[PDB]
Amino acid sequence: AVSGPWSGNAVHKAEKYFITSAKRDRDGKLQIELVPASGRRKLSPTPEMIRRLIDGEIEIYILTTQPDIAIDMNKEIIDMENRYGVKWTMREIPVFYHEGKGLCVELHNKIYTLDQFFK
């Protein structure tokens, strides 16, 4: 099921990972590295670790201050804040698994793919 508050971080209900860099290779494939909230090891989104995401054992997120996020996140973030210190707001986007495309980010009612999303 789920581990207790005492095991790992207490705030987390499932283990938490953050995509920290999204550089590309010579062939243009997106090399995604995600480190856990503790942050002492580097992993890539392999099927075995995606398989955890199907059962909710882990959760993946992206910061909006990432150096290579490709999409102009600050302008859109600034607009929403103005709708309802505005600059320096930072958010965590919850990455989800789409069987057809793999990891997608439902940003502003529009599904995206990590390769489409990142530079």
Partner 1 sequence: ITAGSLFSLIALVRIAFFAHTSPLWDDLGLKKNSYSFPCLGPVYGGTCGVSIQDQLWFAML
Partner 2 sequence: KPRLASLGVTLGRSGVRQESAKAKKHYFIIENLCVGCGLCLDKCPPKVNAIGYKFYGDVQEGGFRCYIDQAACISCSACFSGDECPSGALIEVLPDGEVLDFSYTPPERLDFDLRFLHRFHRE
Partner 3 sequence: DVTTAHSDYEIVLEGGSSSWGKVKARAKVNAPPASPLLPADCDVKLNVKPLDPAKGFVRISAVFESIVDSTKNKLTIEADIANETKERRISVGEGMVSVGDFSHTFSFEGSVVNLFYYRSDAVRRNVPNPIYMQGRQFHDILMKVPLDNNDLIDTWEGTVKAIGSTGAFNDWIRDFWFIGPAFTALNEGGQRISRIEVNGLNTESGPKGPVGVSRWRFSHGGSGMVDSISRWAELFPSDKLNRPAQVEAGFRSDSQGIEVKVDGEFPGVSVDAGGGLRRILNHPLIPLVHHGMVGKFNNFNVDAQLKVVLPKGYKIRYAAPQYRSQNLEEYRWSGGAYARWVEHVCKGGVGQFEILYAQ
Pick the stretch among 33-41, 69-77, 78-86, 102-110 that binds partner 3 (CB under 8 A). Answer: 33-41
Evaluate whether 62 touches 71 at the Cβ level (below 8 Å). Answer: no
8 binds partner 2 per the rule CB under 8 A: yes
Burial 48-68 (b: 16+ CB within 10 A, else e): eeeeebeeeebbbbbebebee
H helices present in the chain, as ranges: 47-54, 73-83, 114-117
46 binds partner 3 per the rule CB under 8 A: yes
15 binds partner 2 per the rule CB under 8 A: yes
Nearest approach in angstroms of CB 44 to partner 3 is 7
| Rounded CA separation 6/115 (Å) | 36
Pick the stretch among 24-32, 37-45, 51-59, 111-119 that binds partner 2 (CB under 8 A). Answer: 37-45
Nearer to partner 1, 7 or 116 (CB): 7
